[PDB]
RNA sequence: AUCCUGAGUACGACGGAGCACGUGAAAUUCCGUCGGAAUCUGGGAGGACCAUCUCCUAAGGCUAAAUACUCUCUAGUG
RNA sequence: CUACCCUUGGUCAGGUUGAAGUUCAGGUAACACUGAAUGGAGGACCGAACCGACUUACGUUGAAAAGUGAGCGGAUGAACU
RNA sequence: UGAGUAGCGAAAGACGGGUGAGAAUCCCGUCCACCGAUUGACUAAGGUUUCCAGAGGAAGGCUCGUCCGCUCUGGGUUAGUCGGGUCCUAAGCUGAGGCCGACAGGCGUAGGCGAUGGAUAACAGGUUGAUAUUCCUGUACCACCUAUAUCGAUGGGGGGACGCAGUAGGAUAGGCGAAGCGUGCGAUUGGAUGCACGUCUAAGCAGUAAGGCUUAUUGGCAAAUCCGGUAGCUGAGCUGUGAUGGGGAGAAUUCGAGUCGUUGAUUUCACACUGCCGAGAAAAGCCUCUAGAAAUAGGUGCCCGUACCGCAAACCGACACAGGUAGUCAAGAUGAGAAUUCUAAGGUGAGCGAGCGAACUCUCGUUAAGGAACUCGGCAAAAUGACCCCGUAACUUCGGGAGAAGGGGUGCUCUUAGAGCCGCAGUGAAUAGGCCCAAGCGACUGUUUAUCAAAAACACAGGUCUCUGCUAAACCGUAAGGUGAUGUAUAGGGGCUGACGCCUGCCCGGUGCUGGAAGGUUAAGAGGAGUGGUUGAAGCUACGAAUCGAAGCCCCAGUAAACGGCGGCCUAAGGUAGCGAAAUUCCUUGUCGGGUAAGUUCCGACCCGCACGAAAGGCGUAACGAUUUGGGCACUGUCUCAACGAGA
RNA sequence: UGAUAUUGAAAUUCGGCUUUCUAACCCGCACCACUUAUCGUGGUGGGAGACAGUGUCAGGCGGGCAGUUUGA
RNA sequence: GGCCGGGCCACCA
């Protein structure tokens, strides 16, 4: 659940945190870690191309099996662990042959539970199957967009999608955003909903806690100078002062759609959202 | 108060040294200009 | 004059450039895109264009000299 | 030099307060809930080093092309290096 | 010229003796004084001979100079083990082939380079004018070589291997004491026979150790007896040896004692343990698995750095410049303390002096009576201040406010809390919060105009809108390639608002955005009816209307935490709640009340809002503030009104 | 946003429209090899497909950026 | 001015 701190300081006022009661092991699995140096929003030219990234705690990457391509072998869930690199918790699963892997922790998954993947797997939480063999109405997560590439959709905390129907070589799915779209029937998905549902409930509480997460402060355009931002300048506070609010790079930024035309996925998207 | 020049042998050689000048066409242009003018010192 | 004589070439449209020439009565030369010939009864030019006449024979290549310059060298000059 | 960032190191005399939890003693059908103890949280408090630069005095052909004296803000953090 | 004028760069010196042509300034001595969480000692960077000795005094040195970081001459830096290379990787840089680009070039794979990190064998003593873990002496260790009698990965696995805070312990360094033992001294100032110190000794090699942790079968590219699945290891310190050696308070090359108590780390065990969320490098060295294919003795061990300065007279500041410069060592008295004051170790007396004791300037101390009358403003100063014990309001988000406020105590001696003793005064010095009432702004810690602005400005946690289905959107780049992200709608970008509480009204006509209708309009292109020039014509040539032909625009709808607007019959609609002479009110010192003897400021009201108003948010709001504003207590040379004293 | 080139085969329906196909082109998809390699190239599947992307031409938007004007 | 029913397009003394 959510822990509500007592207002012992002005910083602690209204601050909340996860209690981490689902985390059964507090340290990662050594053989599955990899270094992850920070980019701080800077590209291969050394130039900042995304604002507000930098600093934050040191983090090691956990190698996650998004593919779930180890078919026909049972795996026991050994522990649920904290992953600094994503909003969901992860689960260390041990296969019957001794291979140890990390998977996204589904809601309700428990230590000692047996998960398996493949066309013949049962419809149970944590099992990964092709969308061809998943019944209509099933809630799934970690959905592939291309066969064998690994799950790409519905991976953050609490994420899910529901299977709607089968139309030829595609399966209809309603995604968490509300979009309804077709996905190839050979693409795999995992049964259930991603866990750690209380992740979005955290009241960060203070600026420094944002800093620990690598978020650098955002400066509003209205308090810049005209050579910095379309909203810059003016004496005293100013309203927008042009027909549309603008991004720092000079493009309308309230309601203007940015999805590009003539994409190959237009034929596959039946109903959109966001 | 702290002044602008804080000497550093390594920094000075890596930014202004001979090999750094040879490393780019414009650095080689610098060396050619200094040889043409007749400088005793071509680089660090 | 029986056969041969440089083909995606010449050329044309659109967009440009180079020609003293700013697209103009703009020939003549070149580039991109797209189209695209004729075969000595042939082809090109003579400042739009047509006919006659006149001159030439593209779409392969090579070629000294007269010309440009002086970090230099040798001998000199103002 | 300076701004931001990346990798890898270093530093923060002392004093104060006393969050969550836990134990005990109650209390209960159960659970709330109460008291003591313990516990040691915090961009927490006072205050050296250290980092600043609010006031004032001096300096203004300066000791100094931005400083000095006296107080002053922060000082386990969005810290300083 | 100004002019023998300003200055001569933070400070304590005095005298004796010496040297010399010449001495406040050089050397030596005694006394005095300054620093001492450092003005002491040692590393790093940087400088690059400034280091040492002898000689010198033209110039340099803010004076002098016999002296010198200056000049001349001659010297000085010694490593198998220290730091670096012959080891390892991070960021980053580079990059065979490769991808991309008018050229030049950009990017990138394997690979490589690259410490600020990982690995890694030497300690004690002595010695010089100048070097020393480098030279010498003593005692070691490591790698390789030879001589005299299983090995295995450029493979697998393990390990290396890691945050932050707090707690209780072990041990040791260090401090203090008694003098146990030893070594000096026992003093003409009244007295005593007591005063002053020392009490050490490494690596290595042995032993020990408080502690701390904890059989079978079958995926890791082939195999595994290893790892994975299933049914004992570490460890500060101690003791001995090292060493009948060395060092020693001292005594005359010889001799000279190394113990008891107490305290006890900031060091180490050790990121051991516990807790927490923000979840905390890599690679090699190393161990092991598989495929696969000894001791002893003697010897050998390279390159680079090594002087000196180094919180500065040698570095960065043009200077022998009141500034800047990473780490380490951390004594005594007092104390919570690395605060304070005085001292130790050790260093230093500051590269102009001598007088005088005017004005004036600067720094400092005191001040009758009064006590903010000063002034824009209590600016500055004064006052408060440590510890122990009582006691403590409105308000509140129940944490706070709070050290609220306001009181009391403190010296020394003796007896077991009392009894006394002394002063004007007992935290007797130094250092150590002033407090209260009220209003505006911003919630808060934080950030900002290096060098006239620190704030009410920025940020912020929180809110909302919007974009984005992943080769995401957004962003850098011509591209390749990247960031976003090794993320995936509980995610990422952009706008606005700015904790929290109660809330956030009306208008979609206009503009923007989003979606509809394919009706009008339009380009390239297609389509060729027709015509002019020329040759009755073809033909060549210059033009040329039917019509087909996208988006956009026009049209329709929606959308205001989009841009905006919120009346004077007109409109799209005419301002809801709340607030209001306001950081907004021109008139204006509005009017009334409060506060003062007197109040253009302030507080509370009124509404007549020139010209408030609901996320360019409205109204409140505990806590917070080197913020702005009004009042009060304390307190004072701010003032009446100036006087005296100290220093420059 | 349209035409055209790259750019191919069949149909349906009114020079177009529409559907289907695979073989060009594409895949920051999978596996395989070069090869101890998240680059690249090749191979094989899968996806997509005459679209997309790119060249040329044309119309539109375009203070994002630029050169300038804004009298006496 | 073009075209269509006022709207789009066009206009280098
Ligand atoms: K989370
Ligand atoms: K040395
Ligand atoms: K409107
Ligand atoms: K509208
Ligand atoms: K009013
Ligand atoms: K107003
Ligand atoms: Mg952002
Ligand atoms: Mg902001
Ligand atoms: Mg501004
Ligand atoms: Mg602008
Ligand atoms: Mg503006
Ligand atoms: Mg304004
Ligand atoms: Mg020919
Ligand atoms: Mg031309
Ligand atoms: Mg021409
Ligand atoms: Mg012409
Ligand atoms: Mg021609
Ligand atoms: Mg220290
Ligand atoms: Mg604090
Ligand atoms: Mg410093
Ligand atoms: Mg600053
Ligand atoms: Mg100061
Ligand atoms: Mg404070
Ligand atoms: Mg403080
Ligand atoms: Mg003069
Ligand atoms: Mg005189
Ligand atoms: Mg004068
Ligand atoms: Mg004078
Ligand atoms: Mg004078
Ligand atoms: Mg001086
Ligand atoms: Mg002293
Ligand atoms: Mg010397
Ligand atoms: Mg002199
Ligand atoms: Mg010398
Ligand atoms: Mg490269
Ligand atoms: Mg190329
Ligand atoms: Mg190093
Ligand atoms: Mg020496
Ligand atoms: Mg690790
Ligand atoms: Mg502990
Ligand atoms: Mg200490
Ligand atoms: Mg810790
Ligand atoms: Mg030395
Ligand atoms: Mg010196
Ligand atoms: Mg001096
Ligand atoms: Mg100095
Ligand atoms: Mg300094
Ligand atoms: Mg201490
Ligand atoms: Mg002190
Ligand atoms: Mg008085
Ligand atoms: Mg008096
Ligand atoms: Mg009084
Ligand atoms: Mg007055
Ligand atoms: Mg007055
Ligand atoms: Mg004051
Ligand atoms: Mg005190
Ligand atoms: Mg008393
Ligand atoms: Mg603030
Ligand atoms: Mg602050
Ligand atoms: Mg300033
Ligand atoms: Mg000014
Ligand atoms: Mg200031
Ligand atoms: Mg990437
Ligand atoms: Mg704001
Ligand atoms: Mg506001
Ligand atoms: Mg509104
Ligand atoms: Mg409308
Ligand atoms: Mg059109
Ligand atoms: Mg058209
Ligand atoms: Mg007015
Ligand atoms: Mg008054
Ligand atoms: Mg008022
Ligand atoms: Mg307003
Ligand atoms: Mg608004
Ligand atoms: Mg006062
Ligand atoms: Mg197009
Ligand atoms: Mg402009
Ligand atoms: Mg110009
Ligand atoms: Mg005029």
Residue numbers in the entry:
A (entry chain C): 2 to 275
B (entry chain 2): 2 to 45
Q: What is the paper's account of this structure, in its own sentences?
A:
In Staphylococcus aureus, an opportunistic pathogen, macrolide resistance is primarily mediated by Erm-family methyltransferases, which mono- or dimethylate A2058 in the 23S ribosomal RNA, reducing drug binding. Our focus is on solithromycin (SOL), a bactericidal fourth-generation macrolide, because of its enhanced ribosomal binding properties.
The data were collected and processed under conditions similar to those of SA_KES34_SOL, yielding a 2.15 Å cryo-EM reconstruction of the 70S ribosome. Multibody refinement focused on the large subunit revealed at 2.08 Å resolution that the antibiotic can be accommodated into the ribosome at high concentrations and bind its pocket, despite the double methylation of A2058. The density of the antibiotic is also clearly defined, indicating stable binding within the ribosome. Despite this change, critical stabilizing interactions are retained, such as those in the proximity of the fluorine atom to C2611 and the aromatic–aromatic (π–π) interaction with the A752:U2609 base pair. These interactions appear sufficient to stabilize SOL within the binding site, even in the presence of a dimethylated A2058. The direct hydrogen bond between the desosamine group of SOL and the N1 of A2058 elongates from 2.75 Å in the unmethylated state to > 3 Å in the dimethylated state, indicating a weaker interaction.
